[PDB]
Amino acid sequence: PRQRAIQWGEDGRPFHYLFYTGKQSYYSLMHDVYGMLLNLEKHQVIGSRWLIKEELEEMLVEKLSDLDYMQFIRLLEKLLTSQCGAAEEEFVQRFRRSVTLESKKQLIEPVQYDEQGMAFSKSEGKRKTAKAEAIVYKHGSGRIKVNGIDYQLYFPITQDREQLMFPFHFVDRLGKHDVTCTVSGGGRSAQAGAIRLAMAKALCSFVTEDEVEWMRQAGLLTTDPRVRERKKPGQEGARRKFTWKKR
Amino acid sequence: KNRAARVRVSKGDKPVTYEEAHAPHYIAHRKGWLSLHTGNLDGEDHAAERTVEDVFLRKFMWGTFPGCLADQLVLKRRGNQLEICAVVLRQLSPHKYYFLVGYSETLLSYFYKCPVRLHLQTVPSKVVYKYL
Amino acid sequence: RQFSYLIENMARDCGEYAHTRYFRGGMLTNARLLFGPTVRLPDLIIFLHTLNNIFEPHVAVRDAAKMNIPTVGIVDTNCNPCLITYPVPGNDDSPLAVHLYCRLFQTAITRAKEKRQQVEALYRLQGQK
Amino acid sequence: SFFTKLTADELWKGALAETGAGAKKGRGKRTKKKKRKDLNRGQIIGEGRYGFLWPGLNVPLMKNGAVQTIAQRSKEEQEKVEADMIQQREEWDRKKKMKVKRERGWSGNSWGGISLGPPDPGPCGETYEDFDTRILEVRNVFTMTAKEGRKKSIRVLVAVGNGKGAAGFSIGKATDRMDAFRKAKNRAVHHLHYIERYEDHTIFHDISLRFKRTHIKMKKQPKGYGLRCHRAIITICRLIGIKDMYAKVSGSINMLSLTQGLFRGLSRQETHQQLADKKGLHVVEIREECGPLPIVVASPRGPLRKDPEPEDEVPDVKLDWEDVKTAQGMKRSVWSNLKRAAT
Amino acid sequence: SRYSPEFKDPLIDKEYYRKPVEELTEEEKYVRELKKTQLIKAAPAGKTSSVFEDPVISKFTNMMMIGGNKVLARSLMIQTLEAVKRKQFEKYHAASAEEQATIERNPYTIFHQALKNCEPMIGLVPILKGGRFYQVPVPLPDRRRRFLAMKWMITECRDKKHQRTLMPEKLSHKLLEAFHNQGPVIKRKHDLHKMAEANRALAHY
Amino acid sequence: KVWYESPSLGSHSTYKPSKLEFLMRSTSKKTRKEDHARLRALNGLLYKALTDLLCTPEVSQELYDLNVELSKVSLTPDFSACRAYWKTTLSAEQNAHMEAVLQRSAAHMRHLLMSQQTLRNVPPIVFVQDKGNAALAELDQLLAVADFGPRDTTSSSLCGIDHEALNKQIMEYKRRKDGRKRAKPRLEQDSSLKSYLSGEEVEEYECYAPD
RNA sequence: GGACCUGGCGGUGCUUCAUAUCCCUCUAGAGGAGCCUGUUCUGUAAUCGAUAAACCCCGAUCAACCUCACCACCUCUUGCUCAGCCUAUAUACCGCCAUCUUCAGCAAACCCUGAUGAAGGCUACAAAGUAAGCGCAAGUACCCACGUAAAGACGUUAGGUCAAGGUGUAGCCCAUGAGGUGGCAAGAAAUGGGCUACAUUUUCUACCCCAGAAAACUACGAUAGCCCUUAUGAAACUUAAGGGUCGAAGGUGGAUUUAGC
Ligand SMILES: [K+]
Ligand SMILES: [K+]
Ligand SMILES: [K+]
Ligand SMILES: [K+]
Ligand SMILES: [K+]
Ligand SMILES: [K+]
Ligand SMILES: [K+]
Ligand SMILES: [Mg+2]
Ligand SMILES: [Mg+2]
Ligand SMILES: [Mg+2]
Ligand SMILES: [Mg+2]
Ligand SMILES: [Mg+2]
Ligand SMILES: [Mg+2]
Ligand SMILES: [Mg+2]
Ligand SMILES: [Mg+2]
Ligand SMILES: [Mg+2]
Ligand SMILES: [Mg+2]
Ligand SMILES: [Mg+2]
Ligand SMILES: [Mg+2]
Ligand SMILES: [Mg+2]
Ligand SMILES: [Mg+2]
Ligand SMILES: [Mg+2]
Ligand SMILES: [Mg+2]
Ligand SMILES: [Mg+2]
Ligand SMILES: [Mg+2]
Ligand SMILES: [Mg+2]
Ligand SMILES: [Mg+2]
């Protein structure tokens, strides 16, 4: 761990004029910032954040209170609002740390071609314990095959068929693509959910970028993380407790 | 409050070793196992026999090297070889450490009918991880 | 706090030390714990204002006496000079008064340090020959 | 069973019963207490009942340049070894039994008056070997606590002094009686008073003061008079270096009020030089053993006044009826002027 | 929840997305560029963009579901909607050209209007005063009014007074009764309102 | 001073009730004994200020005619909002007029309150309507609109004992038929000194190939 | 006896509160019926422990013999053991835990205040607190940074366990130890928890969701009773499984009450 060096010499005289504050590094910075604000008066966001207290406590190599951190930030913001020059901009940037934002843009699967030259895309989806892999063809008549079976024969429940409709209906492409998908594990609903996600991800290769973002905002490209919760010992279920015995 | 294998906070004067300082929930997270063998793997047999043998070897070595062990034993089994790795102190004369190694290796080899080796690492004093 | 910046600069320029911030409990009476067993404490504490922001005596006045440190202090008409070794009755509020005090102490301190170097240098040159 | 046996640490932790509801609140008292004993202390590796001699473990490995062989002590030779180890065990116990006794204080069961030694050396190579520490009061204070009920702490009052005028006192507080001793004696050495002594044996003048409800009246006395004072005052006076003084304590007899009241009165005594400087006159001491010889004890450093001090025919000073009643032979007490040990 | 607070609920509405940019306000433009940076929850399997989607019927279906048996709950609802439509087609063909104009044959319009005729405007709350319980009238929020209309309809059909009659025939008969401001469920509304009027004096509490 | 406490050491401190002070405050800090007093008394001052504005015609002609009466005025400790309560009128029609004018007046009143430099920093005032049972008139608004439709087991428990169960119990039986002393804590005896006066006696070079 | 401090308590004030949470609100239940199981009481020659929250399908992830520690009878005495004891004491203890904890505090070592009294030590435009360490936190496990696990100090209830084992003190040693044979563990009842029901969102069959029948004294409803068979075992009116016979109470349950975001 980084060690603060001795703060006085052989004669016992501290090196820094703010030694006896106990926070010479923190108060030396406040003194430098306060002095700059004075000189300005005499003269006259998305990609960046303020450093956290644990990062300021390392630049200074000192221990800092929570209010000490706030006071320093309140003083820098008061310095940005002023007509700060180039010298007053390199300084503030020392305490600004770049904030990286992940892009929520959906990744588009590559468009492949089969032996006959028909363009198609392939993706995968997971719902609970069900795992689906769907092949969506660029051109088709609206046929959906699930493990080699007609979707309405594989999914006799009307709600499971509605889930297959949801991705295509949302982008107005019913009757325009052929799909051959395979699904294993889980129940009937989990399999329909896994196929819905698999078809939606593969379908993104044949729609415009704006349409892919509308599907994302419609919940059609997000893997559902809701899975069965474990039972805990000493209780009836994942959450239910045993009856609190009558007293 | 949980008690199992937990050295409790005191006044800051009690030296504990790295092993003693970690409660059971840290096993496989911060601390490893003191014995390694195949008996507890899936589809493996003779876990009961390896367990009793290990309990004995720990008691045997504690009383055969009284006041000399500076930490728990590490027991290693490869094939039929049994390796005992012990961290010991530097108080006993080296002649007595060679006697007890020769004596213990032979006695344990005839007891469990396997080649047994004892590996001693000496430390000037018990290694202290923290003062609880 | 009107003069915190001025006083910190005066200290740095003369080669001395300033404490214009919130004075923490035991900085003087518990210095070895806070700084270390070999910390050297001040030989002289100069108060440009002897009262804190709640109009009570600065804690360092009492703590300086406890540690047998002599204190110089500007004492206005509402201040208590009993424990200040060298009190100076004077206005501590007007910027002109406070600025004057800083010039005098800064100049007195700077002259005394230069005098020490002059004497030492002469004492060495004369010593060799 | 071999596998049901435990280690010595486990057995002593159980047998001693130092952790438990008995030992949490001292709910159990210990006139008879199990004492931990180290059973590996006098044990030699290699030594057993059968008396075998193992070369390299309990006997030398080589004898006469040749390796020794396995041997066994004779039945007679082994009885001696067993007997010798039993005697060594009583000798070890007898050595522990022989512990140097410490002197008692004001009474056999009292802490007051007992020496604690010099304060500990400070962090910066500071030492206080010249200072002695004496206990004045050890109290058990009981604090009622929100969750833990009545808890027991210790408040200790100790005084320190070097016997040459420098002395002080400090209170100590801790859960343990020995931590309170450390805090009190170490803190007191940083709060030392200097006490002026006349001829390095007594006070400069009679001192009568009240601190809260505790009254202390002290009288300057000649050499050989000794310390005829409250036992606590005697203890403090030995630390200051006062050899001859009379003191009478009246009102509340509170050790703390008495201690800090005594230091307040001894620190505000005017010396003869201060009186001479204050009045610019000579201070002349008249001793009956020296007859009419005038002995100048102090002379003013500044100019010497030429106008005599006014001689008020009758001084308007307040007198103590106790002092006057004694000088007139009207003080009758069976307890006054009793023969006592040298103090 | 397995969704971190950062996850926002999905907006399933085709129209909301095809709306041209020019029609958008500066506030609605900000909301749209913001969602492109937000995390979106996966759309639940219940609701889709289908044009036949009705959230009220989906809610009534869930309130009829026993032990997670949505297939059976959904079956009962679609059987009730078919039973309502057939009862109206039979009343329609048996009516005169003048009466035919007033006969509704859409089961969704009947279902919605039947529930709206059962929503209680004001409800009572049991309050304790001097060791004695007295109810107090209070206005009902929109969420609570719609819930009570459903719960009263489902509760009435589950009453044991009905002997061996299947749910699609019980519910279909009750919906058409309430659609005409008649029935037990409408009486429960009327009586709740009536009990509130009696307790107007206690409304100060 | 009075029985009302005024011993505070920082009695000369400048009272600073602003929104910025709340953010720059130690989280551990808790309100002192006389810290509530300033809040209790500052809230009362706001009540005084608002009451005068309502009854003086100069502030506003519409406000004066309304003759609004303030039931309660309590500022918040956060310093972000202020709670003011006015008494409702019987006529719901009249209630709407008062609320409408008060709602628009509040904005101007806030600036009028800023005229008092002592209370220049006044958080936005929340003119809550209460004290007049606003929810009772609201209920009547619904009551008239609402459609009412066409207009027209053991006495043992009362006794307090289960006489039946006990009667069976006895019948079933008939079927088969046919202090210490506590020591004062201060006086508990200790032997630490006796162990002390008895005595406390708990009681280099290195070479390669040594001999 | 006076004054004060702490704690406890107040049919004690004020303000803000609890998120499956104190009340209402939401869903499914318990409280009624039968059965399964625990405890209590009663009974028996016939264990023991838990037993308000924090006991009551609890020690037991388990009692036909064995297990077993119990009762009756008979037998052995340096005894499987360099003996033995499930004898007393959990108010001597280790060990392992419950509880608040669905907490966030505990605190060594110093320093300062109150006259150096018991005590107290915070104000950020800051007024005497600094603090190692422990806990929380962080981290790690599981499918994420979410959630759930795990973790959770000090202290509280002399909380539970001497019958897991070990063990201090006290007691037995031809018996309070050891072995054998047989036997006990029932219900006049009360009560806790659970199971199955009372049915039509149901019952039976096919199927695993586009069906056909049933549907009130031959319906729904026992996993109960009775009889038989089989499995395990040396041993089964006794334990379990299956078949036959039988077709009961029960018609959705007062005060009250449990769990779930
Ligand atoms: K109290
Ligand atoms: K029930
Ligand atoms: K215990
Ligand atoms: K035990
Ligand atoms: K025992
Ligand atoms: K026996
Ligand atoms: K039950
Ligand atoms: Mg469940
Ligand atoms: Mg636990
Ligand atoms: Mg001034
Ligand atoms: Mg004695
Ligand atoms: Mg029942
Ligand atoms: Mg029992
Ligand atoms: Mg019992
Ligand atoms: Mg018990
Ligand atoms: Mg209890
Ligand atoms: Mg048995
Ligand atoms: Mg026995
Ligand atoms: Mg206990
Ligand atoms: Mg996490
Ligand atoms: Mg847990
Ligand atoms: Mg944690
Ligand atoms: Mg107990
Ligand atoms: Mg038997
Ligand atoms: Mg049967
Ligand atoms: Mg058989
Ligand atoms: Mg039948």
UniProtKB/Swiss-Prot annotation, chain A:
Region (Disordered): 225-247
This protein's UniProt keywords: Acetylation, Mitochondrion, Ribonucleoprotein, Ribosomal protein, Transit peptide
Any one GO BP annotation for this protein: mitochondrial translation
GO molecular function, one term: RNA binding
Coiled-coil positions: none
Residue numbers of N6-acetyllysine PTMs: K138
Major localisation: mitochondrion
Subcellular location: Mitochondrion
GO CC annotation terms, alphabetical: mitochondrial inner membrane; mitochondrial small ribosomal subunit; mitochondrion; nucleolus
Family to which this protein belongs: Belongs to the universal ribosomal protein uS9 family.
Assembly and interaction partners: Component of the mitochondrial small ribosomal subunit (mt-SSU). Mature mammalian 55S mitochondrial ribosomes consist of a small (28S) and a large (39S) subunit. The 28S small subunit contains a 12S ribosomal RNA (12S mt-rRNA) and 30 different proteins. The 39S large subunit contains a 16S rRNA (16S mt-rRNA), a copy of mitochondrial valine transfer RNA (mt-tRNA(Val)), which plays an integral structural role, and 52 different proteins.
Protein name as catalogued: Small ribosomal subunit protein uS9m
Top-level taxonomy: Eukaryota, Metazoa, Chordata, Craniata, Vertebrata
Residue window of the full protein shown: 133 to 396 of 396
From Swiss-Prot, chain C:
Keywords on record: Disease variant, Mitochondrion, Primary mitochondrial disease, Ribonucleoprotein, Ribosomal protein
Keyword Ribonucleoprotein: yes
Gene Ontology molecular function, alphabetical: structural constituent of ribosome
Record's disease association: Combined oxidative phosphorylation deficiency 36: An autosomal recessive, multisystem disease resulting from deficiencies of mitochondrial respiratory enzyme complexes and mitochondrial dysfunction. Clinical manifestations include sensorineural hearing impairment, mild developmental delay, hypoglycemia, and intellectual disability.
Quaternary structure note: Component of the mitochondrial small ribosomal subunit (mt-SSU). Mature mammalian 55S mitochondrial ribosomes consist of a small (28S) and a large (39S) subunit. The 28S small subunit contains a 12S ribosomal RNA (12S mt-rRNA) and 30 different proteins. The 39S large subunit contains a 16S rRNA (16S mt-rRNA), a copy of mitochondrial valine transfer RNA (mt-tRNA(Val)), which plays an integral structural role, and 52 different proteins.
Role summary: Required for mitoribosome formation and stability, and mitochondrial translation.
Protein's name according to its UniProt entry: Small ribosomal subunit protein uS2m
Species name: Homo sapiens
Taxonomic path: Eukaryota, Metazoa, Chordata, Craniata, Vertebrata
Designated gene of the protein: MRPS2
Curated annotation (Swiss-Prot), chain D:
Keyword match Ribonucleoprotein: yes
GO terms, molecular function: RNA binding; structural constituent of ribosome
Keywords: Mitochondrion, Ribonucleoprotein, Ribosomal protein
Keyword Ribosomal protein listed: yes
Compartment(s) of residence: Mitochondrion
Lineage: superkingdom: Eukaryota
Coiled coil (UniProt feature): none
Chief localization: mitochondrion
GO biological process: mitochondrial translation; translation
Domain S5 DRBM, chain residue ranges per copy: 131-195
Cellular component per GO, a single term: mitochondrion
Subunit (UniProt): Component of the mitochondrial small ribosomal subunit (mt-SSU). Mature mammalian 55S mitochondrial ribosomes consist of a small (28S) and a large (39S) subunit. The 28S small subunit contains a 12S ribosomal RNA (12S mt-rRNA) and 30 different proteins. The 39S large subunit contains a 16S rRNA (16S mt-rRNA), a copy of mitochondrial valine transfer RNA (mt-tRNA(Val)), which plays an integral structural role, and 52 different proteins.
Protein family per UniProt: Belongs to the universal ribosomal protein uS5 family.
Protein's recorded name: Small ribosomal subunit protein uS5m
Organism, as annotated: Homo sapiens
Curated annotation (Swiss-Prot), chain E:
Effect of substituting M150V: In COXPD34; results in decreased mitochondrial protein synthesis and reduced levels of respiratory complexes; MRPS7 mRNA and protein levels are reduced
Key words, A-Z: Acetylation, Disease variant, Mitochondrion, Primary mitochondrial disease, Ribonucleoprotein, Ribosomal protein, Transit peptide
Residues annotated with N6-acetyllysine modification: K174, K194
Organism, as annotated: Homo sapiens
Disease with which this protein is associated in UniProt: Combined oxidative phosphorylation deficiency 34: An autosomal recessive disorder caused by mitochondrial dysfunction and combined respiratory chain deficiencies of complexes I, III and IV. Clinical manifestations are variable and include congenital sensorineural deafness, lactic acidemia, and progressive hepatic and renal failure.
Protein family: Belongs to the universal ribosomal protein uS7 family.
Annotated localization: Mitochondrion
Shown residues within the full chain: 35 to 239 of 242
Signal sequence coordinates: none
Subunit and interaction comment: Component of the mitochondrial small ribosomal subunit (mt-SSU), essential for mitochondrial protein synthesis. Mature mammalian 55S mitochondrial ribosomes consist of a small (28S) and a large (39S) subunit. The 28S small subunit contains a 12S ribosomal RNA (12S mt-rRNA) and 30 different proteins. The 39S large subunit contains a 16S rRNA (16S mt-rRNA), a copy of mitochondrial valine transfer RNA (mt-tRNA(Val)), which plays an integral structural role, and 52 different proteins.
GO cellular component, one term: mitochondrial small ribosomal subunit
TM ranges: none
